[PDB]
Amino acid sequence: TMSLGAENSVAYSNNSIAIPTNFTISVTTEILPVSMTKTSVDCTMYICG
Amino acid sequence: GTGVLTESNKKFLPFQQFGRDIADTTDAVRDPQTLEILDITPCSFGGVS
Ligand SMILES: *[C@@H]1O[C@H](CO)[C@@H](O[C@@H]2O[C@H](CO)[C@@H](O)[C@H](O)[C@H]2NC(C)=O)[C@H](O)[C@H]1NC(C)=O
Numbered sequence: 001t002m003s004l005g006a007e008n009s010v011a012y013s014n015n016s017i018a019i020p021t022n023f024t025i026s027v028t029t030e031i032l033p034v035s036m037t038k039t040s041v042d043c044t045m046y047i048c049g
Numbered sequence: 050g051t052g053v054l055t056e057s058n059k060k061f062l063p064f065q066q067f068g069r070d071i072a073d074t075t076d077a078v079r080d081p082q083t084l085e086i087l088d089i090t091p092c093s094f095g096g097v098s
């Protein structure tokens with residue numbers, strides 16, 4: 001059975017807050033297609049010979 | 050068939066007669082005389098704009 005995710009629990013209370021003291025500059029990628037290959041066909045040359 | 054006949058380097062086996070492409074059309078053929086081996090290629094063609 002696939003592991004749905006890493007189990008975690010955050011300590012919540014109604015008078016406590018958590019504030020970062022440091023940062024981290026991260027770089028991520030993302031690939032997106034734009035245009036495929038333009039194609040054309042010949043009717044008679046294909047249907048006939 | 051209509052096409053251009055050129056010298057071919059294909060090493061036919063002695064019993065082999067034709068040569069077929071992906072579309073099962075005779076690509077390389079053996080002439081009855083001289084037992085020569087040829088290539089059959091459609092003549093130059095294309096689109097006009
Ligand atoms: C700030 O303090 C709170 C409580 O004093 C921390 O919350 C606990 O964290 C431990 C970590 O091992 C857990 O085992 C406890 O279950 C948490 N408490 C509760 C009530 O769930 C909190 O982690 C602290 N902050 C940081 C950044 O460590």
Ligand SMILES: *[C@@H]1O[C@H](CO)[C@@H](O[C@@H]2O[C@H](CO)[C@@H](O)[C@H](O)[C@H]2NC(C)=O)[C@H](O)[C@H]1NC(C)=O
Nearest residue numbers: 017018019020021022023024025026027028029
């Ligand atoms: C915030 O994080 C950075 C990197 O995680 C800390 O910079 C490191 O500091 C230690 C000790 O000064 C060095 O040995 C490392 O080489 C540093 N890393 C880099 C990438 O420069 C930085 O100290 C953290 N902020 C604070 C306030 O401690």
Ligand SMILES: *[C@@H]1O[C@H](CO)[C@@H](O)[C@H](O)[C@H]1NC(C)=O
Nearest residue numbers: 010011012013014015016017
């Ligand atoms: C936070 O919740 C507890 C009950 O879990 C309650 O007793 C307490 O009064 C709350 N805090 C405040 C500031 O009201």
Ligand SMILES: *[C@@H]1O[C@H](CO)[C@@H](O)[C@H](O)[C@H]1NC(C)=O
Nearest residue numbers: 079080081082083084085086
């Ligand atoms: C026909 O071609 C073959 C192949 O070279 C040759 O051996 C034969 O003599 C030819 N016969 C005639 C009648 O041209």
